[PDB]
Amino acid sequence: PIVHQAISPRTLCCWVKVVEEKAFSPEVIPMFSALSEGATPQDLNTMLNTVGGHQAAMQMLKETINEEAAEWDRLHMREPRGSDIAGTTSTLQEQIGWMTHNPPIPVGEIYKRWIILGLNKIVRMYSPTSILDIRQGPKEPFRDYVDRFYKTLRAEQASQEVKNAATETLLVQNANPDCKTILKALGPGATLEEMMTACQ
Amino acid sequence: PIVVHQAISPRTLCCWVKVVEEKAFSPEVIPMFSALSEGATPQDLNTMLNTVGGHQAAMQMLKETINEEAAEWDRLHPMREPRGSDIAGTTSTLQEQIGWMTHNPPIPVGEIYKRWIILGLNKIVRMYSPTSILDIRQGPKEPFRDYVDRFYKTLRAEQASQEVKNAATETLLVQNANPDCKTILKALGPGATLEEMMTACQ
Amino acid sequence: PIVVHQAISPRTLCCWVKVVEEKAFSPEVIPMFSALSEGATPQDLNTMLNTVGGHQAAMQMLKETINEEAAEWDRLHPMREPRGSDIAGTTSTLQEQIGWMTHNPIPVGEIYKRWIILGLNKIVRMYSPTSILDIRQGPKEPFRDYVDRFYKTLRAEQASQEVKNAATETLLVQNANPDCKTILKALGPGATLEEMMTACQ
Amino acid sequence: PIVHQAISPRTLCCWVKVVEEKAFSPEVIPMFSALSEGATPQDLNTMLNTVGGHQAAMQMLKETINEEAAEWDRLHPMREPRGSDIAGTTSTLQEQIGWMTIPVGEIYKRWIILGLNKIVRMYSPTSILDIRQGPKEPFRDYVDRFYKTLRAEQVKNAATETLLVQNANPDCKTILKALGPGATLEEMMTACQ
Amino acid sequence: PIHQAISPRTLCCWVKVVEEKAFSPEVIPMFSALSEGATPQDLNTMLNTVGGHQAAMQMLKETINEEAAEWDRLHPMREPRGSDIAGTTSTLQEQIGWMTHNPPIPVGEIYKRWIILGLNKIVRMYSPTSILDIRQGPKEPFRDYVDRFYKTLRAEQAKNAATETLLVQNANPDCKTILKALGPGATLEEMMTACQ
Ligand SMILES: CC(C)(C#Cc1ccc(-c2ccc(Cl)c3c(NS(=O)(=O)C4CC4)nn(CC(F)F)c23)c([C@H](Cc2cc(F)cc(F)c2)NC(=O)Cn2nc(C(F)F)c3c2C(F)(F)[C@@H]2C[C@H]32)n1)S(C)(=O)=O
Ligand SMILES: CC(C)(C#Cc1ccc(-c2ccc(Cl)c3c(NS(=O)(=O)C4CC4)nn(CC(F)F)c23)c([C@H](Cc2cc(F)cc(F)c2)NC(=O)Cn2nc(C(F)F)c3c2C(F)(F)[C@@H]2C[C@H]32)n1)S(C)(=O)=O
Ligand SMILES: CC(C)(C#Cc1ccc(-c2ccc(Cl)c3c(NS(=O)(=O)C4CC4)nn(CC(F)F)c23)c([C@H](Cc2cc(F)cc(F)c2)NC(=O)Cn2nc(C(F)F)c3c2C(F)(F)[C@@H]2C[C@H]32)n1)S(C)(=O)=O
Ligand SMILES: CC(C)(C#Cc1ccc(-c2ccc(Cl)c3c(NS(=O)(=O)C4CC4)nn(CC(F)F)c23)c([C@H](Cc2cc(F)cc(F)c2)NC(=O)Cn2nc(C(F)F)c3c2C(F)(F)[C@@H]2C[C@H]32)n1)S(C)(=O)=O
Ligand SMILES: CC(C)(C#Cc1ccc(-c2ccc(Cl)c3c(NS(=O)(=O)C4CC4)nn(CC(F)F)c23)c([C@H](Cc2cc(F)cc(F)c2)NC(=O)Cn2nc(C(F)F)c3c2C(F)(F)[C@@H]2C[C@H]32)n1)S(C)(=O)=O
């Protein structure tokens, strides 16, 4: 991070604990983006290395980083190439110069964008169930069904405009017969609080 | 957060996630949240709310409550002035929020967004404990300590007015107790403090 | 706290919550509390007590003890002077507390912490119902575990340090199971705990 | 670490928690290297002492440190720092502070990291060629184990493509053979899911 | 510490360490590192927060009393007595004065010496088995046997020749033969690789 303080312990320890506990859920992307503020490519690589397990997801993230680096190289101190942004062929001093020079070339931000895109891909892939396939079970409380529905919806990552249409149609459509009837009788526009209180 | 523009510290986010994971949604989550988000800007509050794993239904209800409060703000309040969606950090850059919060007289957008979030959290906590104070009753072979713990947890979750707190706590504790401990407590005499009651019922 | 009025730090609250959750209510919670709340204002102490999950009965008893101490203060002690409910932070703004504690040469925060510590001592004494005289070594229980339980109950009781020596010396040997009782009686007077445990283990 | 403030608690505590939870996996090397920034030899020894358990791995690390110290003494015959001076066994804190304020810390950390790499390679006994998908084993878990072993062993990339076909259960073997060459890992896993 | 009160993170980490590791040798360096410049009151606060193991804490208190009596015999603001070093009969102001006076009276260092001696005793008591009694089991992996052997060695805190010969001596028949055939001077990595 940029002075140029070395990545703090607490940050790495918390990042490791997060990736271990939460597995790969949408909350890993904001957490990551918040723990890697102003981080240089070397620091981002140190963060990604400390990730235990999930090595398939890490390999897929590395593949996405290589794809973005190839695209950068095709479209484009010395100028930074694609593998230069990923911190494979650039010293910490070169990165510090690139990011601190005036005008600056924020290589850290670019690498973090690539990593966050890869993480979005990973999150979408770790939630295989589609919005249209989730339906309330027979003897399943409505709360658990709503939780699963909204978790899958956040994993899919569709535009908020489509978010509203899906939230309103699919939630009512896939409800079990009892709660389906209760909700259909509740009336249109019924807020989520009213539905949850009615079904409980 | 502001205290310059320091980025939200790691410890804060990590502890907030750990709290929301461990305690689920209990009354102690509201003070914890309010204490971990001191001087936090709207973007930081949204970063905190995003890191909350699971409980996505409660987060949707919180978002709906925030939209309601924002509509009310816009109705009451038609650099530039901050609109409703600017307080919630949906249509305002970090620089605009910092400018609003650093001016004098400052427009504390952070405090307002935190008020809205705390109202939503009160709703969530009250809804996650569906049993009412008047519906909670001591079991047959349940020690008095466990019944008192459940009773006071439900009472703090309902969070009504203080007069309710005192009257309900003592009257309902004696009323809903099991027959044996009910008799023991009624024999203890009026004014009985909780310590004496627990010592008698053990 | 006033070190300027710094807000209660996150790490402190998180460690306090984790401590109260893991250890339940054991004597070691009181020193921990007193050490984590240095110079804390009444609002900060209330924030700490609020974040305590579960154990709501003990917290209500603590609130009742705080009310008792506030009533005693109000009786003994009739900006303005702080009444009982002002010390507990129920009828005083953060600014009034900061002024009271920062005025040269009345640290109300320390007083509120004294009250809370008295309440916590009562709570700890109540959470250990067994008395020192009721603890006795089991049939096939290692001597180390019996000593651990004995000294845990002794620290929980919070009696006068005067009775500590008499009880530790007489009762520890008295409440031992027959085999280790004979071994220790043969060890001879003036033995240290290390020697006793080495002999029994 | 270089003023010379004493090693902070948080660093030691996180190091202990990491070494305990993750045992000895490749992710321990970056963690160690990041937690010991500017640390003096005494600080590195304080870190190594607090490591609970895994005493066999710690003894192997100590032997590797002695080997590297002997090699240093052979290559390199205030005063000059000997081998046992870098390892902090025959040097006072003041001499270390003077030398680093000759980066003894970086050299000692290089030795320790080499030993830790050896330890990690030894903690993963399974070879890349022995891992094969089970009968009722999800493909994701098989891929995770494969890449974990590959990272532990530290050509590899070329081998990955052959091993993918090799470690494929008959059903998944047919699916992969039909998928066609040059299939990316994302596409491959999406097809096999 | 040197006089801010002991920070939260330090106390919380100390409690978690004493809980997790129980009483193992690695607790002594950790303790010595967490109490740098700590006053006697801070050391007492650290020792109080230790949950459980109250027998070991009583033994530590007895060791502290022994060392305080020895000090009082050897050395018969005011001069610090035995109970003054342990923070039992001295106010925070007296400790701050003793430690801040130009002639350093290290109450922290002396109390920490006493506490570390007691803790070494406790650790030695928690590992009753001797190095010469440890032997590889019938169906026990060689790695676990080496780990137990070296843990016991660290508990004994007594060396290289004996440890290395006894390691091969106390092995299981199969691994004993394998190691004896491996040849002298083989490193532990090679031995473990052969026995794997
Ligand atoms: C990328 C960064 C910089 C960011 C951000 C950012 C900015 C604004 C908002 C935000 C704040 C307040 C409101 Cl009112 C709305 C809102 N209202 S609205 O009804 O759409 C109507 C106005 C159109 N929309 N947004 C998202 C915006 F993009 F429009 C809002 C958000 C909010 C923060 C938030 C989360 C939460 F849990 C509860 C809560 F109170 C607020 N994030 C999301 O809600 C994310 N999410 N998306 C969905 C979708 F799957 F359904 C869902 C959520 C879920 F909430 F988790 C809940 C599962 C359903 N983050 S960074 C690194 O910091 O991550
Ligand atoms: C919103 C913020 C700013 C706040 C606050 C604030 C202010 C004052 C007090 C407080 C302090 C001292 C006293 Cl003596 C009383 C008191 N005495 S009284 O008997 O009512 C009689 C005088 C009328 N009342 N109050 C609450 C006040 F609002 F009246 C008192 C409190 C106290 C702090 C406290 C909690 C605790 F656990 C133990 C303890 F020692 C003290 N909070 C509550 O007690 C909250 N609570 N409410 C109830 C109800 F379900 F029964 C219960 C509690 C429970 F304690 F958790 C316990 C389950 C039963 N918080 S913030 C962000 O920091 O949250
Ligand atoms: C209130 C505050 C400010 C305090 C304090 C304070 C002051 C002095 C001492 C202390 C230090 C050194 C020694 Cl030698 C003695 C000692 N020697 S003596 O044999 O009594 C003989 C001289 C008469 N007595 N004291 C207590 C004093 F008050 F006299 C000693 C202590 C010590 C600190 C300590 C704890 C420990 F775990 C191990 C250890 F090494 C030292 N605390 C106690 O021992 C507490 N305790 N009390 C008993 C009783 F149930 F048996 C027991 C303990 C138990 F240890 F936990 C162990 C279970 C048995 N704390 S605060 C906020 O910081 O809490
Ligand atoms: C008291 C303080 C200040 C200290 C210290 C200090 C100083 C030097 C060394 C040290 C550093 C490098 C080397 Cl090469 C050797 C070495 N090489 S040698 O083969 O003996 C041959 C030269 C004679 N000896 N020493 C110890 C010295 F005293 F001689 C070495 C050590 C080292 C640090 C270290 C630990 C580790 F885990 C792995 C590692 F790589 C290095 N500590 C020990 O090893 C401690 N230990 N002792 C034994 C005994 F039971 F077998 C064992 C260990 C065990 F390692 F845990 C492993 C279980 C077997 N600490 S403080 C507060 O910071 O604690
Ligand atoms: C020693 C220090 C200083 C370091 C470092 C350093 C430098 C560059 C890179 C790096 C960054 C970006 C890219 Cl694109 C590549 C890349 N692309 S490539 O496909 O090889 C093709 C270009 C040739 N290779 N490298 C490694 C380089 F050395 F070549 C890349 C790395 C990266 C950082 C990273 C880790 C991750 F989890 C996901 C991710 F996105 C990126 N580390 C590794 O990937 C390590 N690893 N090695 C293998 C091997 F078993 F297969 C595997 C990984 C695994 F990723 F974990 C995944 C299991 C498979 N670390 S320190 C103290 O900080 O540790």
XYZ file of all heavy atoms in Angstrom, chain B residues 30-31 34-35 152-153 155-157 162 165-166 169, chain C residues 43 45-47 49-50 52 56-57 59-60 62-64 66-67 88-90 112 116, ligand 2, unseen atoms left out:
322
model
N -27.344 -4.212 17.700
C -27.613 -2.817 17.355
C -26.570 -1.934 18.034
O -25.963 -1.086 17.364
C -29.046 -2.411 17.735
C -30.055 -3.296 16.997
C -29.291 -0.945 17.401
C -31.438 -3.277 17.596
N -26.329 -2.075 19.343
C -25.247 -1.286 19.953
C -23.894 -1.587 19.343
O -23.098 -0.668 19.119
C -25.305 -1.687 21.433
C -26.654 -2.268 21.625
C -27.001 -2.927 20.336
N -23.761 0.232 16.018
C -23.640 1.670 16.230
C -22.257 2.055 16.735
O -21.778 3.158 16.446
C -24.711 2.142 17.213
O -24.659 3.547 17.388
N -21.598 1.165 17.483
C -20.277 1.471 18.024
C -19.168 1.231 17.008
O -18.144 1.923 17.043
C -20.020 0.636 19.277
N -35.948 -12.079 29.624
C -35.305 -10.781 29.452
C -34.767 -10.603 28.041
O -34.765 -9.480 27.525
C -34.205 -10.593 30.492
C -34.758 -10.102 31.809
C -35.025 -10.980 32.848
C -35.047 -8.758 31.999
C -35.547 -10.529 34.043
C -35.566 -8.302 33.189
C -35.819 -9.190 34.204
O -36.336 -8.730 35.389
N -34.351 -11.684 27.381
C -33.961 -11.558 25.981
C -35.147 -11.110 25.135
O -35.036 -10.178 24.330
C -33.400 -12.883 25.464
C -32.877 -12.813 24.035
C -32.319 -14.149 23.562
C -33.408 -15.204 23.415
N -34.470 -14.787 22.457
N -37.830 -9.546 26.161
C -38.230 -8.197 26.548
C -37.318 -7.153 25.922
O -37.792 -6.114 25.447
C -38.233 -8.061 28.068
C -38.973 -6.837 28.610
C -40.463 -6.927 28.297
C -38.740 -6.691 30.106
N -36.006 -7.400 25.921
C -35.093 -6.457 25.288
C -35.286 -6.433 23.779
O -35.060 -5.398 23.144
C -33.648 -6.800 25.629
C -32.678 -5.696 25.272
C -31.256 -6.080 25.618
N -30.324 -5.004 25.310
C -29.005 -5.119 25.357
N -28.423 -6.255 25.697
N -28.252 -4.069 25.050
N -35.689 -7.561 23.187
C -35.954 -7.573 21.754
C -37.180 -6.737 21.415
O -37.176 -5.992 20.428
C -36.137 -9.010 21.267
N -39.927 2.395 28.653
C -39.293 1.954 29.893
C -40.323 1.552 30.943
O -40.119 0.578 31.681
C -38.384 3.059 30.431
N -40.965 -1.700 30.482
C -39.849 -2.534 30.917
C -39.993 -2.917 32.387
O -39.981 -4.104 32.728
C -38.525 -1.806 30.671
C -37.430 -2.106 31.693
C -36.133 -1.388 31.354
C -36.269 0.123 31.466
N -35.007 0.813 31.079
N -40.257 -1.939 33.258
C -40.289 -2.244 34.690
C -41.537 -3.037 35.071
O -41.449 -4.120 35.688
C -40.240 -0.946 35.505
C -39.082 -0.045 35.118
O -38.340 -0.328 34.178
N -38.929 1.058 35.842
N -41.458 -6.511 33.400
C -40.422 -7.394 33.910
C -40.867 -8.028 35.217
O -41.000 -9.254 35.303
C -39.118 -6.618 34.107
N -21.139 6.235 29.167
C -21.722 5.778 27.911
C -20.949 4.590 27.353
O -21.545 3.641 26.833
C -21.755 6.922 26.897
N -19.161 2.365 29.100
C -19.444 1.196 29.925
C -20.804 0.603 29.582
O -20.966 -0.624 29.538
C -19.381 1.573 31.404
C -18.009 2.012 31.918
C -18.122 2.614 33.305
C -17.046 0.838 31.929
N -21.796 1.461 29.330
C -23.108 0.963 28.932
C -23.051 0.302 27.561
O -23.743 -0.693 27.319
C -24.125 2.100 28.950
C -24.405 2.603 30.351
O -25.183 2.006 31.092
N -23.772 3.709 30.719
N -22.245 0.845 26.647
C -22.064 0.201 25.350
C -21.425 -1.174 25.508
O -21.784 -2.121 24.798
C -21.213 1.081 24.432
O -21.895 2.316 24.179
C -20.948 0.377 23.113
N -21.650 -3.149 28.226
C -22.614 -4.048 28.853
C -23.740 -4.425 27.896
O -24.294 -5.525 27.995
C -23.182 -3.404 30.115
C -22.166 -3.120 31.222
C -22.783 -2.271 32.321
C -21.622 -4.414 31.803
N -24.094 -3.527 26.974
C -25.147 -3.826 26.010
C -24.723 -4.922 25.042
O -25.515 -5.815 24.720
C -25.522 -2.560 25.240
C -26.299 -1.577 26.079
O -27.103 -1.969 26.922
N -26.071 -0.289 25.848
N -23.052 -7.420 25.474
C -22.988 -8.744 26.077
C -24.194 -9.552 25.618
O -25.342 -9.214 25.927
C -22.935 -8.650 27.606
C -23.078 -10.032 28.225
C -21.643 -7.989 28.053
N -28.753 -12.647 30.165
C -29.533 -11.444 30.430
C -29.988 -11.358 31.884
O -30.193 -10.253 32.398
C -30.735 -11.395 29.489
C -30.359 -11.374 28.012
C -29.589 -10.127 27.613
O -29.427 -9.201 28.407
N -29.110 -10.098 26.374
N -30.144 -12.494 32.566
C -30.493 -12.459 33.984
C -29.390 -11.802 34.803
O -29.655 -10.945 35.657
C -30.765 -13.875 34.491
N -27.219 -9.715 33.709
C -27.154 -8.303 33.347
C -28.260 -7.507 34.030
O -28.043 -6.362 34.443
C -27.230 -8.149 31.830
C -26.211 -8.993 31.074
S -24.531 -8.839 31.714
C -24.253 -7.080 31.529
N -29.451 -8.092 34.164
C -30.517 -7.418 34.900
C -30.148 -7.267 36.372
O -30.424 -6.228 36.987
C -31.828 -8.190 34.757
C -33.025 -7.505 35.396
C -33.445 -6.252 34.652
O -32.902 -5.932 33.597
N -34.423 -5.537 35.198
N -27.114 -7.007 37.485
C -26.120 -5.939 37.487
C -26.790 -4.572 37.425
O -26.364 -3.630 38.102
C -25.159 -6.117 36.313
C -24.121 -5.013 36.111
C -23.268 -4.840 37.346
C -23.253 -5.322 34.904
N -27.839 -4.445 36.611
C -28.558 -3.177 36.522
C -29.221 -2.832 37.851
O -29.211 -1.672 38.282
C -29.596 -3.251 35.402
C -30.190 -1.911 34.996
C -31.016 -2.028 33.718
C -32.340 -2.736 33.961
N -33.181 -2.792 32.733
N -29.787 -3.834 38.527
C -30.393 -3.591 39.833
C -29.346 -3.163 40.856
O -29.585 -2.250 41.655
C -31.138 -4.840 40.306
C -32.404 -5.133 39.506
C -33.173 -6.333 40.027
O -32.686 -6.993 40.970
O -34.266 -6.618 39.489
N -26.573 -1.616 40.174
C -26.182 -0.257 39.812
C -27.212 0.738 40.327
O -26.863 1.825 40.802
C -25.990 -0.138 38.290
C -24.793 -0.975 37.840
C -25.781 1.316 37.893
C -24.749 -1.225 36.351
N -28.499 0.387 40.237
C -29.538 1.258 40.782
C -29.392 1.399 42.294
O -29.582 2.488 42.848
C -30.923 0.718 40.429
C -31.357 1.102 39.031
O -31.635 0.242 38.198
N -31.423 2.404 38.766
N -24.701 6.732 36.185
C -24.971 5.581 35.336
C -25.217 5.958 33.881
O -25.480 5.067 33.065
C -26.175 4.808 35.880
N -25.137 7.240 33.534
C -25.288 7.648 32.152
C -26.696 7.579 31.607
O -26.872 7.542 30.385
N -27.710 7.563 32.475
C -29.095 7.528 32.023
C -29.692 8.917 31.854
O -30.590 9.098 31.025
C -29.962 6.738 33.007
O -29.874 7.332 34.308
C -29.515 5.286 33.074
N -18.594 4.683 38.398
C -19.499 3.754 37.726
C -18.832 2.396 37.542
O -19.484 1.350 37.666
C -19.942 4.326 36.380
C -21.120 3.610 35.744
C -21.842 2.646 36.437
C -21.503 3.896 34.443
C -22.911 1.993 35.854
C -22.571 3.248 33.851
C -23.271 2.298 34.560
O -24.335 1.652 33.972
N -20.092 -1.289 38.806
C -20.221 -2.438 37.917
C -19.386 -3.599 38.438
O -19.782 -4.764 38.329
C -19.827 -2.059 36.478
C -20.817 -1.041 35.906
C -19.788 -3.301 35.597
C -20.328 -0.342 34.651
C -28.830 3.783 22.969
C -27.484 3.791 23.718
C -26.821 5.174 23.571
C -27.718 3.541 25.134
C -27.909 3.336 26.297
C -28.136 3.092 27.694
C -28.282 4.164 28.571
C -28.502 3.885 29.918
C -28.571 2.553 30.335
C -28.807 2.301 31.796
C -27.718 2.436 32.666
C -27.881 2.224 34.036
C -29.141 1.888 34.522
Cl -29.332 1.626 36.268
C -30.248 1.753 33.683
C -31.590 1.433 33.917
N -32.183 1.139 35.186
S -33.745 0.771 35.422
O -33.803 -0.392 36.268
O -34.396 0.705 34.138
C -34.483 2.139 36.347
C -33.827 3.513 36.120
C -35.198 3.200 35.489
N -32.217 1.448 32.702
N -31.318 1.770 31.724
C -31.829 1.829 30.389
C -32.506 3.191 30.154
F -32.925 3.271 28.863
F -33.573 3.310 30.987
C -30.082 1.968 32.289
C -28.414 1.515 29.397
C -28.471 0.033 29.808
C -27.014 -0.460 29.809
C -26.811 -1.745 30.624
C -27.129 -2.980 30.052
C -26.925 -4.137 30.809
F -27.244 -5.330 30.242
C -26.426 -4.125 32.114
C -26.123 -2.863 32.635
F -25.630 -2.783 33.897
C -26.301 -1.672 31.924
N -29.253 -0.716 28.832
C -30.191 -1.616 29.172
O -30.436 -1.853 30.352
C -30.897 -2.284 28.164
N -31.817 -3.274 28.743
N -33.034 -3.071 28.626
C -33.698 -4.116 29.227
C -35.218 -4.313 29.345
F -35.592 -5.323 28.514
F -35.528 -4.646 30.627
C -32.746 -4.989 29.728
C -31.525 -4.434 29.402
C -30.423 -5.294 29.897
F -29.712 -4.605 30.825
F -29.620 -5.658 28.862
C -31.070 -6.536 30.550
C -31.930 -7.418 29.702
C -32.561 -6.311 30.484
N -28.198 1.786 28.099
S -26.396 2.505 23.045
C -25.919 3.030 21.433
O -25.207 2.462 23.859
O -27.176 1.303 22.895
